JSON list of C-alpha atoms in Angstrom, two decimals:
[
{"chain": "A", "resi": 1, "resn": "UNK", "atom": "CA", "xyz": [7.53, -22.72, 1.02]},
{"chain": "A", "resi": 2, "resn": "UNK", "atom": "CA", "xyz": [3.98, -22.84, -0.34]},
{"chain": "A", "resi": 3, "resn": "UNK", "atom": "CA", "xyz": [3.62, -24.55, -3.70]},
{"chain": "A", "resi": 4, "resn": "UNK", "atom": "CA", "xyz": [1.97, -21.56, -5.40]},
{"chain": "A", "resi": 5, "resn": "UNK", "atom": "CA", "xyz": [3.58, -18.16, -5.20]},
{"chain": "A", "resi": 6, "resn": "UNK", "atom": "CA", "xyz": [0.77, -15.56, -5.34]},
{"chain": "A", "resi": 7, "resn": "UNK", "atom": "CA", "xyz": [1.12, -12.13, -3.66]},
{"chain": "A", "resi": 8, "resn": "UNK", "atom": "CA", "xyz": [-1.36, -11.27, -0.93]},
{"chain": "A", "resi": 9, "resn": "UNK", "atom": "CA", "xyz": [-2.51, -8.27, -2.96]},
{"chain": "A", "resi": 10, "resn": "UNK", "atom": "CA", "xyz": [-1.99, -6.49, -6.26]},
{"chain": "A", "resi": 11, "resn": "UNK", "atom": "CA", "xyz": [-3.02, -2.95, -7.16]},
{"chain": "A", "resi": 12, "resn": "UNK", "atom": "CA", "xyz": [-3.91, -2.13, -10.77]},
{"chain": "A", "resi": 13, "resn": "UNK", "atom": "CA", "xyz": [-4.85, 1.15, -12.48]},
{"chain": "A", "resi": 14, "resn": "UNK", "atom": "CA", "xyz": [-8.49, 1.81, -13.33]},
{"chain": "A", "resi": 15, "resn": "UNK", "atom": "CA", "xyz": [-8.99, 1.40, -17.09]},
{"chain": "A", "resi": 16, "resn": "UNK", "atom": "CA", "xyz": [-5.57, -0.24, -17.52]},
{"chain": "A", "resi": 17, "resn": "UNK", "atom": "CA", "xyz": [-3.74, -3.55, -17.20]},
{"chain": "A", "resi": 18, "resn": "UNK", "atom": "CA", "xyz": [-2.88, -5.74, -14.22]},
{"chain": "A", "resi": 19, "resn": "UNK", "atom": "CA", "xyz": [-0.94, -8.96, -13.73]},
{"chain": "A", "resi": 20, "resn": "UNK", "atom": "CA", "xyz": [-1.86, -11.43, -10.95]},
{"chain": "A", "resi": 21, "resn": "UNK", "atom": "CA", "xyz": [1.18, -13.66, -10.49]},
{"chain": "A", "resi": 22, "resn": "UNK", "atom": "CA", "xyz": [0.71, -17.39, -9.92]},
{"chain": "A", "resi": 23, "resn": "UNK", "atom": "CA", "xyz": [3.82, -19.50, -10.25]},
{"chain": "A", "resi": 24, "resn": "UNK", "atom": "CA", "xyz": [5.25, -22.79, -9.02]},
{"chain": "A", "resi": 25, "resn": "UNK", "atom": "CA", "xyz": [8.29, -25.01, -9.52]},
{"chain": "A", "resi": 26, "resn": "UNK", "atom": "CA", "xyz": [7.28, -27.97, -11.69]},
{"chain": "A", "resi": 27, "resn": "UNK", "atom": "CA", "xyz": [7.99, -31.43, -10.33]},
{"chain": "A", "resi": 28, "resn": "UNK", "atom": "CA", "xyz": [9.07, -34.24, -12.60]},
{"chain": "A", "resi": 29, "resn": "UNK", "atom": "CA", "xyz": [6.49, -36.99, -12.89]},
{"chain": "A", "resi": 30, "resn": "UNK", "atom": "CA", "xyz": [3.39, -34.82, -12.52]},
{"chain": "A", "resi": 31, "resn": "UNK", "atom": "CA", "xyz": [1.28, -33.32, -15.29]},
{"chain": "A", "resi": 32, "resn": "UNK", "atom": "CA", "xyz": [-0.61, -30.08, -14.90]},
{"chain": "A", "resi": 33, "resn": "UNK", "atom": "CA", "xyz": [-4.16, -31.08, -15.89]},
{"chain": "A", "resi": 34, "resn": "UNK", "atom": "CA", "xyz": [-6.26, -28.12, -14.80]},
{"chain": "A", "resi": 35, "resn": "UNK", "atom": "CA", "xyz": [-5.83, -24.45, -14.02]},
{"chain": "A", "resi": 36, "resn": "UNK", "atom": "CA", "xyz": [-8.83, -22.56, -12.69]},
{"chain": "A", "resi": 37, "resn": "UNK", "atom": "CA", "xyz": [-8.97, -18.88, -11.81]},
{"chain": "A", "resi": 38, "resn": "UNK", "atom": "CA", "xyz": [-11.90, -17.85, -9.66]},
{"chain": "A", "resi": 39, "resn": "UNK", "atom": "CA", "xyz": [-13.33, -14.60, -8.32]},
{"chain": "A", "resi": 40, "resn": "UNK", "atom": "CA", "xyz": [-15.23, -13.97, -5.09]},
{"chain": "A", "resi": 41, "resn": "UNK", "atom": "CA", "xyz": [-18.84, -12.81, -5.13]},
{"chain": "A", "resi": 42, "resn": "UNK", "atom": "CA", "xyz": [-19.47, -12.53, -2.25]},
{"chain": "A", "resi": 43, "resn": "UNK", "atom": "CA", "xyz": [-19.27, -15.53, 0.06]},
{"chain": "A", "resi": 44, "resn": "UNK", "atom": "CA", "xyz": [-18.71, -17.98, -2.83]},
{"chain": "A", "resi": 45, "resn": "UNK", "atom": "CA", "xyz": [-16.22, -18.00, -5.68]},
{"chain": "A", "resi": 46, "resn": "UNK", "atom": "CA", "xyz": [-17.18, -18.37, -9.33]},
{"chain": "A", "resi": 47, "resn": "UNK", "atom": "CA", "xyz": [-14.93, -19.69, -12.02]},
{"chain": "A", "resi": 48, "resn": "UNK", "atom": "CA", "xyz": [-13.74, -17.05, -14.49]},
{"chain": "A", "resi": 49, "resn": "UNK", "atom": "CA", "xyz": [-11.18, -19.10, -16.45]},
{"chain": "A", "resi": 50, "resn": "UNK", "atom": "CA", "xyz": [-10.35, -22.77, -17.07]},
{"chain": "A", "resi": 51, "resn": "UNK", "atom": "CA", "xyz": [-7.32, -24.32, -18.79]},
{"chain": "A", "resi": 52, "resn": "UNK", "atom": "CA", "xyz": [-8.05, -27.99, -19.46]},
{"chain": "A", "resi": 53, "resn": "UNK", "atom": "CA", "xyz": [-7.38, -30.67, -22.06]},
{"chain": "A", "resi": 54, "resn": "UNK", "atom": "CA", "xyz": [-9.30, -28.70, -24.69]},
{"chain": "A", "resi": 55, "resn": "UNK", "atom": "CA", "xyz": [-7.53, -25.38, -24.08]},
{"chain": "A", "resi": 56, "resn": "UNK", "atom": "CA", "xyz": [-8.31, -22.01, -22.49]},
{"chain": "A", "resi": 57, "resn": "UNK", "atom": "CA", "xyz": [-11.90, -20.99, -21.74]},
{"chain": "A", "resi": 58, "resn": "UNK", "atom": "CA", "xyz": [-13.16, -17.74, -20.22]},
{"chain": "A", "resi": 59, "resn": "UNK", "atom": "CA", "xyz": [-16.16, -18.66, -18.08]},
{"chain": "A", "resi": 60, "resn": "UNK", "atom": "CA", "xyz": [-17.83, -15.35, -17.23]},
{"chain": "A", "resi": 61, "resn": "UNK", "atom": "CA", "xyz": [-19.17, -12.85, -19.74]},
{"chain": "A", "resi": 62, "resn": "UNK", "atom": "CA", "xyz": [-17.71, -9.75, -18.11]},
{"chain": "A", "resi": 63, "resn": "UNK", "atom": "CA", "xyz": [-14.14, -11.04, -18.65]},
{"chain": "A", "resi": 64, "resn": "UNK", "atom": "CA", "xyz": [-14.59, -11.96, -22.32]},
{"chain": "A", "resi": 65, "resn": "UNK", "atom": "CA", "xyz": [-11.99, -10.14, -24.39]},
{"chain": "A", "resi": 66, "resn": "UNK", "atom": "CA", "xyz": [-10.15, -8.91, -21.27]},
{"chain": "A", "resi": 67, "resn": "UNK", "atom": "CA", "xyz": [-8.45, -11.95, -19.71]},
{"chain": "A", "resi": 68, "resn": "UNK", "atom": "CA", "xyz": [-5.21, -13.76, -20.60]},
{"chain": "A", "resi": 69, "resn": "UNK", "atom": "CA", "xyz": [-3.37, -16.47, -18.68]},
{"chain": "A", "resi": 70, "resn": "UNK", "atom": "CA", "xyz": [0.34, -17.09, -19.26]},
{"chain": "A", "resi": 71, "resn": "UNK", "atom": "CA", "xyz": [1.32, -20.47, -20.74]},
{"chain": "A", "resi": 72, "resn": "UNK", "atom": "CA", "xyz": [4.84, -20.13, -22.19]},
{"chain": "A", "resi": 73, "resn": "UNK", "atom": "CA", "xyz": [6.95, -21.08, -19.17]},
{"chain": "A", "resi": 74, "resn": "UNK", "atom": "CA", "xyz": [6.10, -24.28, -17.27]},
{"chain": "A", "resi": 75, "resn": "UNK", "atom": "CA", "xyz": [5.01, -23.30, -13.79]},
{"chain": "A", "resi": 76, "resn": "UNK", "atom": "CA", "xyz": [3.73, -19.83, -14.74]},
{"chain": "A", "resi": 77, "resn": "UNK", "atom": "CA", "xyz": [-0.05, -19.49, -14.87]},
{"chain": "A", "resi": 78, "resn": "UNK", "atom": "CA", "xyz": [-0.28, -15.78, -14.10]},
{"chain": "A", "resi": 79, "resn": "UNK", "atom": "CA", "xyz": [-3.45, -13.95, -15.08]},
{"chain": "A", "resi": 80, "resn": "UNK", "atom": "CA", "xyz": [-3.60, -10.58, -16.87]},
{"chain": "A", "resi": 81, "resn": "UNK", "atom": "CA", "xyz": [-6.64, -8.37, -17.06]},
{"chain": "A", "resi": 82, "resn": "UNK", "atom": "CA", "xyz": [-7.17, -5.51, -19.53]},
{"chain": "A", "resi": 83, "resn": "UNK", "atom": "CA", "xyz": [-9.37, -2.38, -19.27]},
{"chain": "A", "resi": 84, "resn": "UNK", "atom": "CA", "xyz": [-9.72, -2.75, -15.53]},
{"chain": "A", "resi": 85, "resn": "UNK", "atom": "CA", "xyz": [-13.16, -1.99, -14.11]},
{"chain": "A", "resi": 86, "resn": "UNK", "atom": "CA", "xyz": [-14.06, -0.92, -10.59]},
{"chain": "A", "resi": 87, "resn": "UNK", "atom": "CA", "xyz": [-16.20, -4.07, -10.37]},
{"chain": "A", "resi": 88, "resn": "UNK", "atom": "CA", "xyz": [-13.03, -6.15, -10.93]},
{"chain": "A", "resi": 89, "resn": "UNK", "atom": "CA", "xyz": [-12.10, -5.39, -7.31]},
{"chain": "A", "resi": 90, "resn": "UNK", "atom": "CA", "xyz": [-12.31, -8.75, -5.48]},
{"chain": "A", "resi": 91, "resn": "UNK", "atom": "CA", "xyz": [-10.30, -11.68, -4.21]},
{"chain": "A", "resi": 92, "resn": "UNK", "atom": "CA", "xyz": [-9.00, -13.96, -6.95]},
{"chain": "A", "resi": 93, "resn": "UNK", "atom": "CA", "xyz": [-8.00, -17.62, -6.59]},
{"chain": "A", "resi": 94, "resn": "UNK", "atom": "CA", "xyz": [-5.38, -19.46, -8.64]},
{"chain": "A", "resi": 95, "resn": "UNK", "atom": "CA", "xyz": [-6.10, -23.24, -8.43]},
{"chain": "A", "resi": 96, "resn": "UNK", "atom": "CA", "xyz": [-3.85, -25.85, -10.07]},
{"chain": "A", "resi": 97, "resn": "UNK", "atom": "CA", "xyz": [-4.41, -29.62, -10.31]},
{"chain": "A", "resi": 98, "resn": "UNK", "atom": "CA", "xyz": [-1.69, -32.15, -11.08]},
{"chain": "A", "resi": 99, "resn": "UNK", "atom": "CA", "xyz": [-1.97, -35.87, -11.84]},
{"chain": "A", "resi": 100, "resn": "UNK", "atom": "CA", "xyz": [0.15, -38.87, -12.67]},
{"chain": "A", "resi": 101, "resn": "UNK", "atom": "CA", "xyz": [-0.73, -41.39, -15.37]},
{"chain": "A", "resi": 102, "resn": "UNK", "atom": "CA", "xyz": [-1.61, -43.99, -12.71]},
{"chain": "A", "resi": 103, "resn": "UNK", "atom": "CA", "xyz": [-4.10, -41.57, -11.18]},
{"chain": "A", "resi": 104, "resn": "UNK", "atom": "CA", "xyz": [-2.51, -39.84, -8.19]},
{"chain": "A", "resi": 105, "resn": "UNK", "atom": "CA", "xyz": [-3.75, -36.25, -7.75]},
{"chain": "A", "resi": 106, "resn": "UNK", "atom": "CA", "xyz": [-2.45, -33.17, -5.97]},
{"chain": "A", "resi": 107, "resn": "UNK", "atom": "CA", "xyz": [-4.23, -29.77, -5.84]},
{"chain": "A", "resi": 108, "resn": "UNK", "atom": "CA", "xyz": [-3.24, -26.37, -4.54]},
{"chain": "A", "resi": 109, "resn": "UNK", "atom": "CA", "xyz": [-4.91, -22.97, -4.57]},
{"chain": "A", "resi": 110, "resn": "UNK", "atom": "CA", "xyz": [-4.08, -19.47, -3.35]},
{"chain": "A", "resi": 111, "resn": "UNK", "atom": "CA", "xyz": [-5.90, -16.15, -3.01]},
{"chain": "A", "resi": 112, "resn": "UNK", "atom": "CA", "xyz": [-4.87, -12.61, -3.88]},
{"chain": "A", "resi": 113, "resn": "UNK", "atom": "CA", "xyz": [-6.72, -9.35, -3.35]},
{"chain": "A", "resi": 114, "resn": "UNK", "atom": "CA", "xyz": [-7.02, -7.16, -6.47]},
{"chain": "A", "resi": 115, "resn": "UNK", "atom": "CA", "xyz": [-7.33, -3.46, -5.71]},
{"chain": "A", "resi": 116, "resn": "UNK", "atom": "CA", "xyz": [-8.23, -0.98, -8.47]},
{"chain": "A", "resi": 117, "resn": "UNK", "atom": "CA", "xyz": [-6.95, 2.55, -8.07]},
{"chain": "A", "resi": 118, "resn": "UNK", "atom": "CA", "xyz": [-7.89, 5.76, -9.90]},
{"chain": "B", "resi": 1, "resn": "UNK", "atom": "CA", "xyz": [0.35, -9.21, 11.16]},
{"chain": "B", "resi": 2, "resn": "UNK", "atom": "CA", "xyz": [-2.20, -10.84, 11.24]},
{"chain": "B", "resi": 3, "resn": "UNK", "atom": "CA", "xyz": [-1.07, -11.55, 14.80]},
{"chain": "B", "resi": 4, "resn": "UNK", "atom": "CA", "xyz": [-2.80, -14.65, 16.14]},
{"chain": "B", "resi": 5, "resn": "UNK", "atom": "CA", "xyz": [-3.32, -15.15, 19.87]},
{"chain": "B", "resi": 6, "resn": "UNK", "atom": "CA", "xyz": [-4.46, -18.49, 21.30]},
{"chain": "B", "resi": 7, "resn": "UNK", "atom": "CA", "xyz": [-6.04, -19.24, 24.66]},
{"chain": "B", "resi": 8, "resn": "UNK", "atom": "CA", "xyz": [-8.17, -21.90, 26.32]},
{"chain": "B", "resi": 9, "resn": "UNK", "atom": "CA", "xyz": [-5.63, -24.60, 27.12]},
{"chain": "B", "resi": 10, "resn": "UNK", "atom": "CA", "xyz": [-5.56, -26.55, 30.34]},
{"chain": "B", "resi": 11, "resn": "UNK", "atom": "CA", "xyz": [-5.03, -29.87, 32.11]},
{"chain": "B", "resi": 12, "resn": "UNK", "atom": "CA", "xyz": [-8.16, -32.04, 31.86]},
{"chain": "B", "resi": 13, "resn": "UNK", "atom": "CA", "xyz": [-9.19, -35.64, 32.51]},
{"chain": "B", "resi": 14, "resn": "UNK", "atom": "CA", "xyz": [-9.51, -38.24, 29.79]},
{"chain": "B", "resi": 15, "resn": "UNK", "atom": "CA", "xyz": [-13.01, -37.95, 28.36]},
{"chain": "B", "resi": 16, "resn": "UNK", "atom": "CA", "xyz": [-13.13, -34.25, 29.15]},
{"chain": "B", "resi": 17, "resn": "UNK", "atom": "CA", "xyz": [-13.52, -31.06, 27.20]},
{"chain": "B", "resi": 18, "resn": "UNK", "atom": "CA", "xyz": [-11.73, -27.80, 26.36]},
{"chain": "B", "resi": 19, "resn": "UNK", "atom": "CA", "xyz": [-12.33, -24.98, 23.92]},
{"chain": "B", "resi": 20, "resn": "UNK", "atom": "CA", "xyz": [-9.44, -23.16, 22.31]},
{"chain": "B", "resi": 21, "resn": "UNK", "atom": "CA", "xyz": [-9.79, -19.69, 20.89]},
{"chain": "B", "resi": 22, "resn": "UNK", "atom": "CA", "xyz": [-7.63, -17.78, 18.46]},
{"chain": "B", "resi": 23, "resn": "UNK", "atom": "CA", "xyz": [-8.01, -14.01, 18.20]},
{"chain": "B", "resi": 24, "resn": "UNK", "atom": "CA", "xyz": [-6.65, -12.42, 15.02]},
{"chain": "B", "resi": 25, "resn": "UNK", "atom": "CA", "xyz": [-5.55, -8.79, 14.67]},
{"chain": "B", "resi": 26, "resn": "UNK", "atom": "CA", "xyz": [-5.93, -6.70, 11.50]},
{"chain": "B", "resi": 27, "resn": "UNK", "atom": "CA", "xyz": [-8.93, -6.38, 9.15]},
{"chain": "B", "resi": 28, "resn": "UNK", "atom": "CA", "xyz": [-8.03, -9.11, 6.64]},
{"chain": "B", "resi": 29, "resn": "UNK", "atom": "CA", "xyz": [-9.08, -12.12, 8.79]},
{"chain": "B", "resi": 30, "resn": "UNK", "atom": "CA", "xyz": [-12.12, -12.86, 6.67]},
{"chain": "B", "resi": 31, "resn": "UNK", "atom": "CA", "xyz": [-10.02, -13.58, 3.57]},
{"chain": "B", "resi": 32, "resn": "UNK", "atom": "CA", "xyz": [-7.79, -16.25, 5.19]},
{"chain": "B", "resi": 33, "resn": "UNK", "atom": "CA", "xyz": [-8.21, -19.97, 5.63]},
{"chain": "B", "resi": 34, "resn": "UNK", "atom": "CA", "xyz": [-7.60, -20.76, 9.32]},
{"chain": "B", "resi": 35, "resn": "UNK", "atom": "CA", "xyz": [-6.18, -23.86, 10.90]},
{"chain": "B", "resi": 36, "resn": "UNK", "atom": "CA", "xyz": [-5.14, -25.57, 14.10]},
{"chain": "B", "resi": 37, "resn": "UNK", "atom": "CA", "xyz": [-1.95, -27.60, 14.43]},
{"chain": "B", "resi": 38, "resn": "UNK", "atom": "CA", "xyz": [-0.41, -29.34, 17.42]},
{"chain": "B", "resi": 39, "resn": "UNK", "atom": "CA", "xyz": [3.00, -30.50, 18.58]},
{"chain": "B", "resi": 40, "resn": "UNK", "atom": "CA", "xyz": [3.36, -33.30, 21.13]},
{"chain": "B", "resi": 41, "resn": "UNK", "atom": "CA", "xyz": [6.54, -34.00, 23.10]},
{"chain": "B", "resi": 42, "resn": "UNK", "atom": "CA", "xyz": [9.38, -35.21, 20.93]},
{"chain": "B", "resi": 43, "resn": "UNK", "atom": "CA", "xyz": [7.24, -35.23, 17.80]},
{"chain": "B", "resi": 44, "resn": "UNK", "atom": "CA", "xyz": [6.80, -32.97, 14.77]},
{"chain": "B", "resi": 45, "resn": "UNK", "atom": "CA", "xyz": [4.02, -30.41, 14.33]},
{"chain": "B", "resi": 46, "resn": "UNK", "atom": "CA", "xyz": [0.90, -32.02, 12.85]},
{"chain": "B", "resi": 47, "resn": "UNK", "atom": "CA", "xyz": [-2.40, -30.91, 11.33]},
{"chain": "B", "resi": 48, "resn": "UNK", "atom": "CA", "xyz": [-5.57, -30.90, 13.45]},
{"chain": "B", "resi": 49, "resn": "UNK", "atom": "CA", "xyz": [-8.35, -28.95, 11.72]},
{"chain": "B", "resi": 50, "resn": "UNK", "atom": "CA", "xyz": [-9.00, -26.16, 9.21]},
{"chain": "B", "resi": 51, "resn": "UNK", "atom": "CA", "xyz": [-11.81, -23.94, 8.04]},
{"chain": "B", "resi": 52, "resn": "UNK", "atom": "CA", "xyz": [-12.23, -22.06, 4.75]},
{"chain": "B", "resi": 53, "resn": "UNK", "atom": "CA", "xyz": [-12.32, -18.24, 4.69]},
{"chain": "B", "resi": 54, "resn": "UNK", "atom": "CA", "xyz": [-16.09, -18.34, 4.10]},
{"chain": "B", "resi": 55, "resn": "UNK", "atom": "CA", "xyz": [-16.81, -21.12, 6.61]},
{"chain": "B", "resi": 56, "resn": "UNK", "atom": "CA", "xyz": [-18.03, -23.23, 3.69]},
{"chain": "B", "resi": 57, "resn": "UNK", "atom": "CA", "xyz": [-15.96, -26.31, 4.46]},
{"chain": "B", "resi": 58, "resn": "UNK", "atom": "CA", "xyz": [-14.04, -27.75, 7.36]},
{"chain": "B", "resi": 59, "resn": "UNK", "atom": "CA", "xyz": [-11.24, -30.32, 7.35]},
{"chain": "B", "resi": 60, "resn": "UNK", "atom": "CA", "xyz": [-10.03, -32.63, 10.12]},
{"chain": "B", "resi": 61, "resn": "UNK", "atom": "CA", "xyz": [-7.25, -35.06, 10.91]},
{"chain": "B", "resi": 62, "resn": "UNK", "atom": "CA", "xyz": [-8.68, -38.57, 11.03]},
{"chain": "B", "resi": 63, "resn": "UNK", "atom": "CA", "xyz": [-7.77, -38.97, 14.67]},
{"chain": "B", "resi": 64, "resn": "UNK", "atom": "CA", "xyz": [-9.94, -36.03, 15.84]},
{"chain": "B", "resi": 65, "resn": "UNK", "atom": "CA", "xyz": [-12.99, -36.41, 13.57]},
{"chain": "B", "resi": 66, "resn": "UNK", "atom": "CA", "xyz": [-16.25, -36.27, 15.48]},
{"chain": "B", "resi": 67, "resn": "UNK", "atom": "CA", "xyz": [-14.51, -35.19, 18.70]},
{"chain": "B", "resi": 68, "resn": "UNK", "atom": "CA", "xyz": [-13.17, -31.78, 17.64]},
{"chain": "B", "resi": 69, "resn": "UNK", "atom": "CA", "xyz": [-15.02, -29.01, 15.87]},
{"chain": "B", "resi": 70, "resn": "UNK", "atom": "CA", "xyz": [-13.52, -25.94, 14.29]},
{"chain": "B", "resi": 71, "resn": "UNK", "atom": "CA", "xyz": [-15.58, -22.80, 13.70]},
{"chain": "B", "resi": 72, "resn": "UNK", "atom": "CA", "xyz": [-14.99, -19.13, 13.02]},
{"chain": "B", "resi": 73, "resn": "UNK", "atom": "CA", "xyz": [-16.63, -15.77, 13.57]},
{"chain": "B", "resi": 74, "resn": "UNK", "atom": "CA", "xyz": [-15.48, -13.34, 10.91]},
{"chain": "B", "resi": 75, "resn": "UNK", "atom": "CA", "xyz": [-17.19, -10.47, 12.75]},
{"chain": "B", "resi": 76, "resn": "UNK", "atom": "CA", "xyz": [-15.25, -11.16, 15.99]},
{"chain": "B", "resi": 77, "resn": "UNK", "atom": "CA", "xyz": [-12.03, -12.08, 14.15]},
{"chain": "B", "resi": 78, "resn": "UNK", "atom": "CA", "xyz": [-11.89, -15.38, 16.08]},
{"chain": "B", "resi": 79, "resn": "UNK", "atom": "CA", "xyz": [-11.49, -19.09, 15.35]},
{"chain": "B", "resi": 80, "resn": "UNK", "atom": "CA", "xyz": [-12.43, -21.79, 17.86]},
{"chain": "B", "resi": 81, "resn": "UNK", "atom": "CA", "xyz": [-11.57, -25.42, 18.43]},
{"chain": "B", "resi": 82, "resn": "UNK", "atom": "CA", "xyz": [-14.09, -27.26, 20.59]},
{"chain": "B", "resi": 83, "resn": "UNK", "atom": "CA", "xyz": [-12.28, -30.33, 21.92]},
{"chain": "B", "resi": 84, "resn": "UNK", "atom": "CA", "xyz": [-14.60, -33.02, 23.32]},
{"chain": "B", "resi": 85, "resn": "UNK", "atom": "CA", "xyz": [-14.01, -36.60, 24.44]},
{"chain": "B", "resi": 86, "resn": "UNK", "atom": "CA", "xyz": [-10.35, -35.81, 24.98]},
{"chain": "B", "resi": 87, "resn": "UNK", "atom": "CA", "xyz": [-7.73, -38.58, 24.96]},
{"chain": "B", "resi": 88, "resn": "UNK", "atom": "CA", "xyz": [-4.21, -38.72, 26.41]},
{"chain": "B", "resi": 89, "resn": "UNK", "atom": "CA", "xyz": [-2.91, -38.79, 22.80]},
{"chain": "B", "resi": 90, "resn": "UNK", "atom": "CA", "xyz": [-4.33, -35.27, 22.36]},
{"chain": "B", "resi": 91, "resn": "UNK", "atom": "CA", "xyz": [-1.75, -33.82, 24.77]},
{"chain": "B", "resi": 92, "resn": "UNK", "atom": "CA", "xyz": [0.27, -31.18, 22.91]},
{"chain": "B", "resi": 93, "resn": "UNK", "atom": "CA", "xyz": [0.86, -27.49, 22.36]},
{"chain": "B", "resi": 94, "resn": "UNK", "atom": "CA", "xyz": [-1.86, -26.23, 19.98]},
{"chain": "B", "resi": 95, "resn": "UNK", "atom": "CA", "xyz": [-1.21, -23.47, 17.44]},
{"chain": "B", "resi": 96, "resn": "UNK", "atom": "CA", "xyz": [-3.51, -21.31, 15.37]},
{"chain": "B", "resi": 97, "resn": "UNK", "atom": "CA", "xyz": [-2.44, -20.48, 11.80]},
{"chain": "B", "resi": 98, "resn": "UNK", "atom": "CA", "xyz": [-3.68, -18.33, 8.90]},
{"chain": "B", "resi": 99, "resn": "UNK", "atom": "CA", "xyz": [-3.04, -18.85, 5.19]},
{"chain": "B", "resi": 100, "resn": "UNK", "atom": "CA", "xyz": [-4.26, -17.75, 1.78]},
{"chain": "B", "resi": 101, "resn": "UNK", "atom": "CA", "xyz": [-5.36, -21.18, 0.60]},
{"chain": "B", "resi": 102, "resn": "UNK", "atom": "CA", "xyz": [-8.99, -21.26, -0.54]},
{"chain": "B", "resi": 103, "resn": "UNK", "atom": "CA", "xyz": [-10.19, -24.84, -0.43]},
{"chain": "B", "resi": 104, "resn": "UNK", "atom": "CA", "xyz": [-7.08, -26.97, -1.02]},
{"chain": "B", "resi": 105, "resn": "UNK", "atom": "CA", "xyz": [-3.80, -27.58, 0.76]},
{"chain": "B", "resi": 106, "resn": "UNK", "atom": "CA", "xyz": [-5.07, -26.81, 4.28]},
{"chain": "B", "resi": 107, "resn": "UNK", "atom": "CA", "xyz": [-3.32, -29.79, 5.93]},
{"chain": "B", "resi": 108, "resn": "UNK", "atom": "CA", "xyz": [0.12, -28.47, 4.99]},
{"chain": "B", "resi": 109, "resn": "UNK", "atom": "CA", "xyz": [1.92, -26.20, 7.44]},
{"chain": "B", "resi": 110, "resn": "UNK", "atom": "CA", "xyz": [3.83, -24.72, 4.48]},
{"chain": "B", "resi": 111, "resn": "UNK", "atom": "CA", "xyz": [0.58, -23.26, 3.10]},
{"chain": "B", "resi": 112, "resn": "UNK", "atom": "CA", "xyz": [0.16, -20.97, 6.13]},
{"chain": "B", "resi": 113, "resn": "UNK", "atom": "CA", "xyz": [1.97, -17.67, 6.67]},
{"chain": "B", "resi": 114, "resn": "UNK", "atom": "CA", "xyz": [1.01, -16.60, 10.21]},
{"chain": "B", "resi": 115, "resn": "UNK", "atom": "CA", "xyz": [1.22, -18.55, 13.46]},
{"chain": "B", "resi": 116, "resn": "UNK", "atom": "CA", "xyz": [0.38, -17.90, 17.11]},
{"chain": "B", "resi": 117, "resn": "UNK", "atom": "CA", "xyz": [2.55, -18.64, 20.15]},
{"chain": "B", "resi": 118, "resn": "UNK", "atom": "CA", "xyz": [0.20, -21.47, 21.16]},
{"chain": "B", "resi": 119, "resn": "UNK", "atom": "CA", "xyz": [-1.73, -22.78, 24.15]},
{"chain": "B", "resi": 120, "resn": "UNK", "atom": "CA", "xyz": [-0.97, -25.95, 26.12]},
{"chain": "B", "resi": 121, "resn": "UNK", "atom": "CA", "xyz": [-3.28, -28.95, 26.43]},
{"chain": "B", "resi": 122, "resn": "UNK", "atom": "CA", "xyz": [-2.70, -31.98, 28.69]},
{"chain": "B", "resi": 123, "resn": "UNK", "atom": "CA", "xyz": [-5.11, -34.88, 29.01]},
{"chain": "B", "resi": 124, "resn": "UNK", "atom": "CA", "xyz": [-4.54, -37.38, 31.83]},
{"chain": "B", "resi": 125, "resn": "UNK", "atom": "CA", "xyz": [-5.54, -41.02, 32.27]}
]
């Protein structure tokens, strides 16, 4: 099984809400130290959200006020968008980094296609 | 699908050269990371090379660095493995795989969802 469970595509309603699942089974001994969500445009991704040691940070203006990332359940870093725009259609990447105190590091990422339907 | 179809295998002399191809079906090729794996007799499947969806980065097993080159053509829905300076240790069945990793995890077979039936490579002393 892949570490991150992310569907190959999600369809959301124009002007409404969508959830992009990204989940994993936490492993004892590792700490989640970074979550990044990225969006494609067009041959390179840009970071739209970071969760780091200083909290949650939206990183692109067009997502300000419209983007939430789950945090309640360990292993669930799903992203929700509000007031979906046609220009939100793209491929989105969930990227998670784990470390140990002695410095080992593991990273995984996974891509979903967001479709927006009228 | 994607269905993945490999070709290009053969029996070659040590020092020689082959090129494997992998033809993908569907229209979603360009969104997948692509990789090559191999399985030698009486051994487990192992990573060989991978290439990001956008061609931006490539990744190689240490043992094939500088001898093998992976490339892709998103317009022709094909991935290639140029295999130069072949060694007997390179003998194996070679498999093409597609996954939705972006730039991490490409060495792990578990991070791929589609696999071809493979093509056979033998390198002789």
